[PDB]
UniProtKB/Swiss-Prot annotation, chains A, B:
The record marks 1000 as: Important for ensuring that an appropriate proportion of lactose is converted to allolactose. Keywords: Glycosidase, Hydrolase, Magnesium, Manganese, Metal-binding, Sodium. The active site is at 462 (proton donor), 538 (nucleophile). Induction: By allolactose. It comes from Escherichia coli (strain K12). NCBIfam families: PRK09525.1. The gene is lacZ. This is Beta-galactosidase. HAMAP family: Beta_gal. Its cofactor is Mg(2+); Mn(2+); Na(+).
Length: 1024, 1024
């Protein structure tokens, strides 16, 4: 045995972390979560095992710059300078280092298997007392659920072992190291290791002991492994539960295994045997294994709709009935099978409403606690998601337990991503890395094998396509034939996948990339020879103000049989909290910790914010993924259930009819629909539209009773329609007053009653308005063509590396943000009962006319200003972002009241969730606090807008706020915005879609581009 | 860096050899045999590269009992007690240890991954001078082609690395260790390692550095890899040679690769490019790889019939034309493809005439030199073999080169056999061993990828069927799609094989073993769902006096399309030379070195002896596997060629007609047959049988001209037929003399002329005969029913563990070897011209009559004794081994002359090669020196036997020798036999077949069992 003074010397001299063939030393075999009960009643009822002891809490910690900087004294006793830290935790989150956010590019110099000499090293220590009885007999092991990236373990000064792979649990046998009473652990964690080359996920790269650490005591003769398989008869009315139990230790003739299956408090099934399997081959079978087969009549099948679980208890006991130890596991009777071309669950065709989820927490980095796991799940269920993809690594054990119990389908990904390699499969087609890769895959499978929520195995992410994938694909298929295996790398449809699984493939647009073309999903299905199902690995890139065109996917998913859904990218913004000089917290993105190079805002692509409040866009997802489809025909509403297994036994349809925001009628019909069935609900003879206006019919599926994951009264689905409409043929009332027009050389001054309008005759714009004597404007009413670029407008274009195709580049190149208004025409005429101002402007840039805008203002005798705007866009100029007006109002008012699509932010290509009604929000809620300031808060389909003492009527989109578009464009972080004096108001006649198929290549569909050349809109601006 | 005094301490403290996850440390990547030429003309013409330096020769060696016994001083300087040994060599072959021969059972205690503490350790050392220029620039590496089993390498006292896997080449970079001038290697070789668990082949387990060791100098910028693939157009009239070259080092813009293809001295094709492959995936392609495509018009296709090779030369050079380095490789244009259900080669259906071959040499253990490799090949070709299975491990590199050049198909097996595990797949279905296994497979493939002789990849042998096989199967299919993958473990037809490949499956007999039933090969093909080809991994177990029923296989192979041959088990007896007290050498088998437990004679299953002389049985193989089939109809001989590619352009048919051994006619016809075609050869009106007797027609295909592997006049095929027969209706000539019969109470004394016969009236047997006055017998003429048990009679039955089913057990149990002759009847009568003796005996055992034998002797007046024998066998008694007579002749004569099937040893179920003729052999050649003494030398179908002054006529089988059956049965080794006085002669009327489907379960087909109950034969014994 080495001595402390040469233990660090020798151990570090070997340099295991730069040797990809050595992934672990003395680590134990992977297996299911064991708890080691000495009482099968406690096993059954899931009671905190006394043999499982958490070591979480206060550890000592020292930070070094490189392994070699550590002092040998550290193995003997705690360093005087060690700080007290809480385990689990990333040490970047305590300011010992900088968390690094790159996307593709490796944080380190790429030279596999070598890592930077300077290699931030974390020295963890724990002093703890061990119970003598644990040491008297049995085996005590230590479990590390997650240490990033590699580490060495000493116990009482003696080197125990070496671990690697940040996302899987490492176990070491400490029975030969522990002594009675005071013991000491010393864990040396390295930030970079050869394993880092296979862990190139798009996330904050942090390090340390970041999942739970514990001790487990198991008796000498012990259950070492335990598999549950389930077979069904044709119609799932009978199941066979096959339990494979493997023991290790002193195999004896009186050992017996009893496997017991419980439904709550009912022992549904039970089987007992002695060890000794059947003959496997020429030399016999496994003496140390036993297979039990339980028959279950009418198994309650597990689904995400109805998560029916059983409790399996495995008793290892003597023939005399003395329990040696018990383990237990939740069992879900469900069958996953790809057949013909469809992924089936219990015989039904799945439709995946999924989302990619990262293990991220703004304060605790990548330490995930139960509390927030539950929160995430509830939010997902409440927004009509039924699946989660573990992007891109084995998740914290508890997660799977929760998904089993709540009802989510899980895609479980192996911790392998070599995205930054050139070419991507440089390692994954290299034999020498196959050992490293295999361990990552195989340990994952062994660990999570028994969960019912896990539906699909994934081979990892973005690692090209190499022979190692083919091998590992086959390995999984061999070992766990009950699930399907998925892998997108290589181009979504290689031979290492059961499912065509692509990332950001567009619905109707082919993207024929060299080598790995990315077809439209509709095309892809039909390509000569393709018989597999297609599920989108990643689609809809939710980078801030996004999900434009989301509806197209769901249209397609519903229409095509082999389009079986996909996973939205992604759940939650990966932002981190930083503090300002006043101690206020703010959301940081790539680069904000001094990490360079980095990929800036690309860490934030969530449907919810890091604090789990939701982005507007999440409601679009909820709508599109709802489980009830509605079709209106006359008085009949056809309700179609998209549930596969559950009957609608907690739903009722509430319906309302309204006339331009006024409630005329309503009712409420118990909704009773069989899985995949229909109900026809005929409405009472609906009110006859009293006057002018549009009738709207709104229906909502409400859930009377609270559920495991929802409040009573939860709205799960909705839909709205236009009904009868009456055009207003009513003539405007005549007024005994004609606005008086005074003309100077500076302005046109129109006066009616106490209202004055001043048109700045040198600019051509309405410059000021008075009510009584109060000036209404701070900034003149002018034409607006630009948008404070969204993430989808910017894409991957950068100041130091421009991408010409990005919309913002096109606009900047075209001078959209620089064009100046040349006053062309300017006249003011008195009509028989009005004043008519007519102007024309040429918006020009470098001698080229980009826009021509012709406007007329009609001030009538009732004090209403009718504005008519005609715009001509140069056909050769990138389509303008918007076509509207804006100004800055002097008035700041409290509430914004309006008639249109709402209440939340909605865009031309993200409207379908929004409902037409009379909405009313405090001004603050008009602004959507995106971490990376950009255009936000547009509300579409607005017929009337009320703010302060101003009313706008017509048909427009509007955006009311405290920040100018300019300020939004300039500002880099949300927390740096300054509410400007007055109120900024944008009123768009037309507005370009926001896109969102991906945030690196222009994804705004043609019909949402302002390409019509000639535009026209009208707006009535009166007081109120 | 560790110091010598703690280098052994530290290195051995880690204990890599008991840790299955650590297979190597600092070993370089596998690749094709490189030679590093600095002149592409030398590359082209295969000239000994000056950059490749052998280190073979005199090394220093010390033997320890365990790693820890080695003294640290050994790393500094040579131990005073180190002996000089020649590398390569197994140290068991120099008496430092005992070679161990077990078959299934592991030589060590089974406790994966742990190996016996006492672990015989070989300490090798080499002092050598290094040329300064090698050290000035470039990379010097050391190559170990085979070190058994694991080893540590130090260079100049500094630990270089760790190697494992006895059959694949290990390379280490020594450029950082070597110094100018005197350097020292220190290699510590361990007999047992964790790798031993995967190396459980049926062979002598020996150890040490047993293949070549050398140094290789490659320039800094170097070719690191190099693949050749070949594609063909539909009819093989155009090929595309795809060369993939990979470099490593300073990739520069002026690097160019030229690949040149030569046909002898003609540059057939050539292509040049710069490094930089095409885009592979989203991040580009391989900057350091280049693919060249050469078009070849009318490629000369490579086959075993016509081994057409090209020479590919790969020049790495600058753009200016400066050669950096060259590598080269022989290329064989051939395509291997399984289609419909058949394994095709260049479009033709293969028929595998193969044999399993071990790398074995009676004096040098497992060190295989070129000389004997060539010898083996020539023998194989000359006995009509066309394929070799590398049983069961990557062979010595040169072997493949030779097979390329001579023309043999090779099955290349990965070095994996876990046969002794329980169950067999205990390791191969265990994730944790998948790294170990994968390296074995992948390194093999990388190494031998480019050979044309290699046709099939094999995943190893007898290791059950586990997930690791499935994975590795897929890996190979992915990486080398041009070949098929074979694996028999699991039951010949799992999903990890392209070919149904079984061991010792019988032709027409199913062997329904629990779990892994072994069907008849005819049945197997047809089993619902089986579409693959079937090739017998191992069949026909040639354990000594065997190959009974061999003809049945070849009958079947020719008849069924999907039976495509197989590999005979096996080529050469694995025996070792030991010495007696006089310094004479003798062949040793398991147990003879004190190795216990062991599997005795099961190491010897060759077609040839260890000294490469041939067992009789080899000629049976040659006959059955000949490439010409003959069918006789009247005067027409139909000759069918079984060549697939070559036309018969060096053959002529010699034919002879003979009458009972007398030549009547002959002729010789140029044999001109197109591949798979026919020629009809009509014979001249054949001689009319002059007198009584049987006409025989013999044809032989002789090869006029010498070939690369045969002498001029080589006989390649033959066949014989019976033609017209004349029955002898000639009456025996009357003689004027009647044997005088004198009767006493002791005997019947018959006297005629100078001949006397004495029948011992108390025994019933002819006891003595005189000619003149010379006694002719030593032992009386008695009935014989037993056989000196063959290996197929004994099987796996042992003195300390009996297997009741073995024929020898049945016979012993029945008392066949103990039955005593009770004289029942005894009379002597005088006939009108003869004396008639009639006797009857009851052969009884424990009160039960086993045989009744009734014999008559008719002494006629010409001095001829006609013997008639009638035998009754008890139906409930295991069928007697033989039914005949035997005696011991006083006369020892020099030559044995006889008319019958010969010349070599032939048995009832191994006759087809033997030809009917007049043969004449010195008595010595009647005895077949099988290492394990047993019944041998039978000659069947004998009509006349001449020995000394005795002539036997009739129709019988006979066995004439110097050893009694008893002595043969008792003696354990060939060298312990003692020629007895006189000559032992057995004359069988009937004889049981020898069997040979396997040597562990009774494999004598029913029609070769003596089961008819009543037997009868006649024999004429006269002087001459």
């Amino acid at each position: 045995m080495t001595m402390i003074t040469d233990s660090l010397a020798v151990v570090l001299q070997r340099r295991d972390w730069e040797n990809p063939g050595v992934t672990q030393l003395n680590r134990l075999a992977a297996h299911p979560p064991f708890a080691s009960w000495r009482n099968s009643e406690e096993a059954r009822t899931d009671r905190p095992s006394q043999q499982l002891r958490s070591l979480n809490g206060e550890w000592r910690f020292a930070w070094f710059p490189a392994p070699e900087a550590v002092p040998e004294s550290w193995l003997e006793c705690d360093l005087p300078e060690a700080d007290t830290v809480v385990v689990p935790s990333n040490w970047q989150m305590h300011g010992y280092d900088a968390p690094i956010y790159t996307n593709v590019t490796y944080p380190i110099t790429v030279n596999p298997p070598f890592v930077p000499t300077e290699n931030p090293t974390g020295c963890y220590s724990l002093t703890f007392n061990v119970d003598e009885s644990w040491l008297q007999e049995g085996q005590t092991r230590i479990i590390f659920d997650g240490v990033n990236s590699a580490f060495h373990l000493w116990c009482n000064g003696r080197w125990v072992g070496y671990g690697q792979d940040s996302r899987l649990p490492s176990e070491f046998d400490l029975s030969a190291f522990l002594r009675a009473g005071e013991n000491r652990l010393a864990v040396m964690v390295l930030r970079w290791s050869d394993g880092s080359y296979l862990e190139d996920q798009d996330m904050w790269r942090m390090s340390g002991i970041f999942r739970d650490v514990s001790l487990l005591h198991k008796p000498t003769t012990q259950i070492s492994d335990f598999h549950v398989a389930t077979r069904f008869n044709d119609d799932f009315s009978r199941a066979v539960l096959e339990a494979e139990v493997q023991m290790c230790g002193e195999l004896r003739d009186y050992l017996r295994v009893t496997v017991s299956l419980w439904q709550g408090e009912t022992q549904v099934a039970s089987g007992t045997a002695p060890f000794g399997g059947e003959i496997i081959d020429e030399r016999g079978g496994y003496a140390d294994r036993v297979t039990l087969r339980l028959n279950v009549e009418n198994p309650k099948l597990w689904s995400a709709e109805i998560p029916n679980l059983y409790r399996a208890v495995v008793e290892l006991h003597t023939a005399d009935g003395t329990l040696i130890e018990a383990e237990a596991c939740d069992v879900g009777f469900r069958e996953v099978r790809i057949e013909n071309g469809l992924l089936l669950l219990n015989g039904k065709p799945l439709l995946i409403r999924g989302v990619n989820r990262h293990e991220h927490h703004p304060l605790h980095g990548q330490v995930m606690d139960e509390q927030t796991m539950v929160q995430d799940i509830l939010l997902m269920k409440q927004n009509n998601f039924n699946a989660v993809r573990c992007s891109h690594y084995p998740n914290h054990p508890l997660w799977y337990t929760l998904c089993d119990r709540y009802g989510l389908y899980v895609v479980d990904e192996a911790n392998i991503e070599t995205h930054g390699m050139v070419p991507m499969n440089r390692l994954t087609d290299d034999p020498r890395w196959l050992p490293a890769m295999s361990e990552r895959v195989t340990r994952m499978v062994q660990r999570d094998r028994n969960h019912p929520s896990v539906i699909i195995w994934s081979l990892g992410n973005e690692s090209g396509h190499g022979a190692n994938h083919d091998a590992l694909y086959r390995w999984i298929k061999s070992v766990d034939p009950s699930r399907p295996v998925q892998y997108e790398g290589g181009g979504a449809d290689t031979t290492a996948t059961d499912i065509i699984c692509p990332m950001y493939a567009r619905v109707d647009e082919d993207q024929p990339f060299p080598a790995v073309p990315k077809w439209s999903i509709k095309k892809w299905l039909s390509l000569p020879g393709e018989t597999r199902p297609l599920i989108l690995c990643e689609y809809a890139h939710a980078m801030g103000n996004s999900l434009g065109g989301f509806a197209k996917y769901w249209q397609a998913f519903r229409q095509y049989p082999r389009l079986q859904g996909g996973f939205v990218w992604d759940w939650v913004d990966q932002s981190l909290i930083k503090y300002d000089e006043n101690g206020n917290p703010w959301s940081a993105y790539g680069g904000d910790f001094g990490d360079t190079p980095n990929d800036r805002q690309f860490c934030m692509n969530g449907l919810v914010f890091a604090d789990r409040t939701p982005h507007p866009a999440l409601t679009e997802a909820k709508h599109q993924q709802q489980f009830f489809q509605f079709r209106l025909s006359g008085q009949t509403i056809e309700v179609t259930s998209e549930y596969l297994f559950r009957h609608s036994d907690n739903e009722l349809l509430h319906w309302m009819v309204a006339l331009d925001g006024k409630p005329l009628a309503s009712g409420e019909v118990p909704l009773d629909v069989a899985p995949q069935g229909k109900q026809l609900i005929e409405l009472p003879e609906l009110p006859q539209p009293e006057s002018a206006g549009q009738l709207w019919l709104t229906v909502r599926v409400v859930q009377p009773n609270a559920t495991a994951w929802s409040e009573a009264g939860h709205i799960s689905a909705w839909q709205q329609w236009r009904l009868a409409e009456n055009l207003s043929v009513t003539l405007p009332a005549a007024s005994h007053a004609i606005p008086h027009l005074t003309t100077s050389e500076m302005d046109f001054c129109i006066e009616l009653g106490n209202k004055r309008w001043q048109f700045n005759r040198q600019s051509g714009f309405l410059s000021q308005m008075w009510i009584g004597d109060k000036k209404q404007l701070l900034t003149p009413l002018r034409d607006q063509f630009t948008r404070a670029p969204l993430d989808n407008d910017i894409g991957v274009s950068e100041a130091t590396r421009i991408d010409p195709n990005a919309w913002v580049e096109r606009w900047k190149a075209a001078g959209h943000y620089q064009a100046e208004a040349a006053l062309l025409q300017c006249t003011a005429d008195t009509l028989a009962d009005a004043v008519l101002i007519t102007t024309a402007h040429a918006w020009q840039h470098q001698g080229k006319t980009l826009f021509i805008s012709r406007k007329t203002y009609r001030i009538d005798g009732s004090g209403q200003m009718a504005i008519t705007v005609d715009v001509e866009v140069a056909s050769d100029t990138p389509h303008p972002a918007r076509i509207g007006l804006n100004c800055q109002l002097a008035q700041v008012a409290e509430r914004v009241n309006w008639l249109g699509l709402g209440p939340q932010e909605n865009y031309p290509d993200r409207l379908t969730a929004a409902c037409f009604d009379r909405w009313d929000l405090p001004l603050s809620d008009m602004y959507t606090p995106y971490v990376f300031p950009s255009e936000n808060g547009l509300r579409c389909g607005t017929r009337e807008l009320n703010y302060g003492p101003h009313q706008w009527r017509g048909d427009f989109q509007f955006n009311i706020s405290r920040y100018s578009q300019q300020q939004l464009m300039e500002t880099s972080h949300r927390h740096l915005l300054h509410a400007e004096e007055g109120t900024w108001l944008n009123i768009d006649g037309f507005h370009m879609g926001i896109g969102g198929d991906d945030s690196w290549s222009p994804s705004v569909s043609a019909e949402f581009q302002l390409s019509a050349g000639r535009y026209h809109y009208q707006l009535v601006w009166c007081q109120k």
